[PDB]
mmCIF file of C-alpha atoms and ligand atoms in Angstrom:
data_model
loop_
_atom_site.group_PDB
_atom_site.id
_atom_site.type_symbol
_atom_site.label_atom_id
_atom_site.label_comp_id
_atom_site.label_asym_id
_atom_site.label_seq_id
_atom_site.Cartn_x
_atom_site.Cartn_y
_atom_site.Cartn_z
ATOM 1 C CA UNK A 1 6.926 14.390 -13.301
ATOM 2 C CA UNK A 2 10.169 12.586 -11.337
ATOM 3 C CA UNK A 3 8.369 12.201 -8.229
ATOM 4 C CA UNK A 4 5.158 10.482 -9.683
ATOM 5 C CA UNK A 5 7.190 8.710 -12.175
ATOM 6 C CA UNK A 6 8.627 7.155 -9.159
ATOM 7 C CA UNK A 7 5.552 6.365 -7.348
ATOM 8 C CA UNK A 8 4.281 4.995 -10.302
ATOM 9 C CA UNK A 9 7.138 2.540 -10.437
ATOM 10 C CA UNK A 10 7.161 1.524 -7.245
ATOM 11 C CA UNK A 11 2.881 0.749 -7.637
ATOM 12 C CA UNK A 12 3.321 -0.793 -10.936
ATOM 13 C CA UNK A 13 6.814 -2.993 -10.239
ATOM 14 C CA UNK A 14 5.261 -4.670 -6.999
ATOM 15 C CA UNK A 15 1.815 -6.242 -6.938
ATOM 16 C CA UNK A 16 1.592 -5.558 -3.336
ATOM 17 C CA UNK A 17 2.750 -1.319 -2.658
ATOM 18 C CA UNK A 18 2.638 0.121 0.690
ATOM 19 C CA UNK A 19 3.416 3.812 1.300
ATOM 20 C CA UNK A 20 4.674 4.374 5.063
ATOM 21 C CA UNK A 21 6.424 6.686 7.285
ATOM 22 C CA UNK A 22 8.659 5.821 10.331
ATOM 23 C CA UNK A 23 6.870 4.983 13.847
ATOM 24 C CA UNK A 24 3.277 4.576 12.096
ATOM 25 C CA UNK A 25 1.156 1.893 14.233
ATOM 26 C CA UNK A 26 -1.483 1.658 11.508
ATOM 27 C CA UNK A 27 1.550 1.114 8.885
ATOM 28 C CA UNK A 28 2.814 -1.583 10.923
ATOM 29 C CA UNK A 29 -0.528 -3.522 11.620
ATOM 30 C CA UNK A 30 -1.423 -3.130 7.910
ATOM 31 C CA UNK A 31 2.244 -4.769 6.792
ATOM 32 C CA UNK A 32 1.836 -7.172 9.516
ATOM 33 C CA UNK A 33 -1.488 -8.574 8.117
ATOM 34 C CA UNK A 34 -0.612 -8.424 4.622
ATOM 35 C CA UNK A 35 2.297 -10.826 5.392
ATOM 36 C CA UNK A 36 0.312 -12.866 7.278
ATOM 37 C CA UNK A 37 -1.070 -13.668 3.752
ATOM 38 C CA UNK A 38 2.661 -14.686 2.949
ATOM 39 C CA UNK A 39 2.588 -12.010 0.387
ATOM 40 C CA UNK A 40 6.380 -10.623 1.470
ATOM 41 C CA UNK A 41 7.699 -12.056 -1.651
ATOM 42 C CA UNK A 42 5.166 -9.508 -3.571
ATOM 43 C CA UNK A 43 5.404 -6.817 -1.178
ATOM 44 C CA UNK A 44 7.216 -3.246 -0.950
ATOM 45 C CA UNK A 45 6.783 -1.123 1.606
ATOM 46 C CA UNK A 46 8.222 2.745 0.994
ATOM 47 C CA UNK A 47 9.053 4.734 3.945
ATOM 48 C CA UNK A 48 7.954 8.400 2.176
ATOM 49 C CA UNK A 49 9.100 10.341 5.377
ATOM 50 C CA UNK A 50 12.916 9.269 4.937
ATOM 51 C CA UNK A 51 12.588 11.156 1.608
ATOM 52 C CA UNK A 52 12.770 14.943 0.905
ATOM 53 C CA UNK A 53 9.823 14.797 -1.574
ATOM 54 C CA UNK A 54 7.252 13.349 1.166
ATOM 55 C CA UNK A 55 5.011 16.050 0.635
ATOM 56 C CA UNK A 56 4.478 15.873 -3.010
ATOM 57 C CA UNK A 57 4.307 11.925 -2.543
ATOM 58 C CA UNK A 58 1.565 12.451 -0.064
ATOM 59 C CA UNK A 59 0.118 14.751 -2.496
ATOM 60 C CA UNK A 60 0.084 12.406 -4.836
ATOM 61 C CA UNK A 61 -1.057 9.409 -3.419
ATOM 62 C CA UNK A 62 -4.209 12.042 -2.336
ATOM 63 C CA UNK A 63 -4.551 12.151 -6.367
ATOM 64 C CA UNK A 64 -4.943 8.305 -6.651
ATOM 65 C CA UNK A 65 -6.612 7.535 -3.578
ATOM 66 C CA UNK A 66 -8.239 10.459 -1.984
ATOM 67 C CA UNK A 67 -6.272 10.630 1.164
ATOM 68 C CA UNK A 68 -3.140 11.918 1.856
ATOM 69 C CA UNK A 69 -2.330 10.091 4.947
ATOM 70 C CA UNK A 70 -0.322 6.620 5.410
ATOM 71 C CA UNK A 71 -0.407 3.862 5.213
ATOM 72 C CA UNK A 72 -1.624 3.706 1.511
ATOM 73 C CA UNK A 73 -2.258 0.464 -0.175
ATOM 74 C CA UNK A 74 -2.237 -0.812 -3.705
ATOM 75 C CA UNK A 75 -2.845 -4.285 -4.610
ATOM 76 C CA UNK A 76 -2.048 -4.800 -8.794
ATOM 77 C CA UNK A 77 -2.454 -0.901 -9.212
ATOM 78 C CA UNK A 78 -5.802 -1.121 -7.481
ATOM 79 C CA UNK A 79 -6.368 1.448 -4.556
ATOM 80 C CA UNK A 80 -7.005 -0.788 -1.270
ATOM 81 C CA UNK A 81 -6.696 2.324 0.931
ATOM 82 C CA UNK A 82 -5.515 2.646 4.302
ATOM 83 C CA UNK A 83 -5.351 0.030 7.273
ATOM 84 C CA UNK A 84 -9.040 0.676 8.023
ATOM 85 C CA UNK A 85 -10.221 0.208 4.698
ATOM 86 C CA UNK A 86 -7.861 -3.021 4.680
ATOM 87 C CA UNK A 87 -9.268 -4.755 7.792
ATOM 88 C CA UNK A 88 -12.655 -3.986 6.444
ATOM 89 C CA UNK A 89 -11.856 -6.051 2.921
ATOM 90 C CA UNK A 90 -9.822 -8.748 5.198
ATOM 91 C CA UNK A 91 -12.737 -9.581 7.694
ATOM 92 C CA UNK A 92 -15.532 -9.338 4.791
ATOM 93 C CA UNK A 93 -13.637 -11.812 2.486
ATOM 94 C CA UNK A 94 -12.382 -9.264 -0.082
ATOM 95 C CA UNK A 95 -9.205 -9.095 0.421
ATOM 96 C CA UNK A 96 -8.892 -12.980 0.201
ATOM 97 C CA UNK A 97 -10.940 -12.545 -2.790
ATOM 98 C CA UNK A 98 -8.313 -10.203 -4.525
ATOM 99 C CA UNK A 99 -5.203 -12.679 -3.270
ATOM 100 C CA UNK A 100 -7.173 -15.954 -4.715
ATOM 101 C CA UNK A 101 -7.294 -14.115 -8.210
ATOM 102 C CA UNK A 102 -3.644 -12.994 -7.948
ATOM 103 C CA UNK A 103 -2.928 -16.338 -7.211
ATOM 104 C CA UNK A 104 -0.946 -15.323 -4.151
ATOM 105 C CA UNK A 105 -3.159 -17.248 -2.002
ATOM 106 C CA UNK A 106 -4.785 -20.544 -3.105
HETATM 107 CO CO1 CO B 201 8.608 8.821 18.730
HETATM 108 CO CO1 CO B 202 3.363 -16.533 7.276
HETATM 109 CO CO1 CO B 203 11.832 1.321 -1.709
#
């Protein structure tokens, strides 16, 4: 119960989560455009490999989202996805969509 207690804390106590691990090109474009929104102020990303529980996190975040890989995304406790499924909502308007009703982008 710790570990997802944990997760849950870090989803729930920033609007904008992102799970990562160190050296991760598709962690680092996903951050990248998500603070191209200006959304750092909102933001947390988690580095899950610098922690000795990265396998049950991974596990877990395969509970919520169905993939175990990072980057994982949550935007207000909503499952985004990965970096693929992000570009896909940021070039067909979604993701603007989701900021606009956050009010993190006007
Ligand atoms: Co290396
Ligand atoms: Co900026
Ligand atoms: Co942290």
């Amino acid at each position: 119960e710790a570990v997802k207690k944990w997760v849950n804390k870090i989803i729930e106590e920033n609007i904008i989560a992102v799970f990562a691990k160190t050296e991760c090109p598709y962690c680092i474009k996903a951050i990248s455009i998500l603070k191209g929104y200006n959304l750092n102020s909102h933001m947390h990303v988690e580095n899950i490999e610098k922690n000795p529980d990265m396998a049950n996190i991974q596990a877990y975040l395969k509970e919520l989202t169905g993939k175990s890989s990072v980057p994982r995304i949550f935007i207000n406790k909503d499952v985004v996805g990965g970096c693929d499924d992000l570009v896909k909502e940021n070039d067909e308007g979604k993701l603007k969509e989701r900021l606009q009703k956050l009010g993190l982008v006007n």
